[PDB]
Symmetry: C2
Subunit: 219 residues, 2 copies
């Protein structure tokens, strides 16, 4: 679960202290973060996902109190006003077409001083028409980029995953947060640590290009 996600420690480090907080998890999946937050003292956790079957597995995994799971479409998201101290989302917002609308919804749902911490696929990773590694004449591993400044839907994971992602530059994402009422708190283009690479050698290639953008914003 979380211990398998290379970017979890970096994203976890960006979170506020979760003890006593009211938290919403946007695109909670099996509820790995929901359970982590509850284990670390969250007063209340609302986990939202489109899949009823996945929410059924999340409920079954426990605990009996403090975590509520509800079916929701992040493209048509509604949240009660002034009801959360923290909004979290792992690798969901790159599938939302009107992300600015979602940001405004999260902003009104957060109490003053609350945070929104989320991960998305990095635009370097999402940009290319034919994403993948290239090995140059010298044997060096490279990541060819095209159309980085041409924003819009990308169908490069449509065949493999059945998803359309929305390519937006780092500036576009941050400007949308700012226009929505957030102050940018921390921005990280994920890089595994040398210790992570020693434990998981396959992470060495992640030094060449970022797969993920991690952002913390405050209202």
């Amino acid at each position: 679960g979380l211990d398998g996600a290379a970017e979890w420690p970096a994203l976890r480090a960006m979170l506020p202290e979760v003890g006593g907080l009211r938290i919403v998890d946007l695109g909670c999946g099996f509820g790995w973060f929901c359970r982590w937050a509850h284990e670390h003292g969250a007063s209340y956790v609302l986990g939202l996902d489109l899949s009823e079957k996945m929410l059924a597995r999340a409920r079954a995994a426990g605990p009996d109190t403090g975590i509520t799971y509800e079916r929701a479409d992040l493209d048509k998201l509604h949240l009660p006003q002034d009801s959360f101290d923290l909004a979290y989302s792992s690798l969901a917002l790159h599938y939302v077409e009107d992300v600015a609308r979602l940001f405004r919804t999260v902003h009104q749902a957060l109490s003053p001083g609350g945070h929104f911490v989320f991960s998305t696929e990095h635009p370097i990773y999402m940009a290319p028409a034919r994403p993948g590694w290239a090995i140059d004449a010298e044997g060096r591993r490279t990541w060819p980029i095209d159309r980085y400044l041409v924003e819009g839907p990308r169908k490069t994971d449509w065949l493999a995953k059945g998803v359309v992602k929305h390519h937006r530059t780092v500036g576009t994402t941050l400007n949308a947060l700012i226009r929505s009422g957030f102050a940018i708190e921390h921005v990280e283009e994920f890089c595994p640590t040398d210790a992570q690479i020693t434990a998981r050698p396959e992470l060495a290639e992640e030094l060449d290009r970022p797969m993920f953008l991690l952002v913390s914003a405050r209202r």
Copy 2:
């Protein structure tokens, strides 16, 4: 000068109104911005550059009063506290090793509500040891994007070292130093700019510049 810079209109659009402001230009070069700011009613303009010869050329370009040029190394910059309304810098910060220290100096130099607006080479552009295009479809291969530190691409030819920092590193350094991020632009020329200057079409594939505006 400024008319030639494709990124100038985008950067100009990020500036506050300059009439009546005290402005510091970090890495002013020939003083194109200093003269522009003066012409648009800035009360005081301080242009700083490492090259005494370049400052002599800037001073000679005029006017007789309104702009002060002084030699400074941005790596060990001193600015008086609460003395400026706007700090501007065009394509200079990528030469600074300890940019967080510089940001702390700029923060304290700016009066409350002051602005800091700058352009730098984008880390996508700077990441490769030897940057360039690959080809039918044009691409920009990157490597070592997450490996921050000196880049020596133009060391032998020009005797300059640039400092590679990711977008997150740059923004976090500003935030930690006391600034609130106002606008971030990975500069993309407009369709009108690309029609007037066909060579600009390649900047749709990868950004050459990062533009940032912040408030303190």
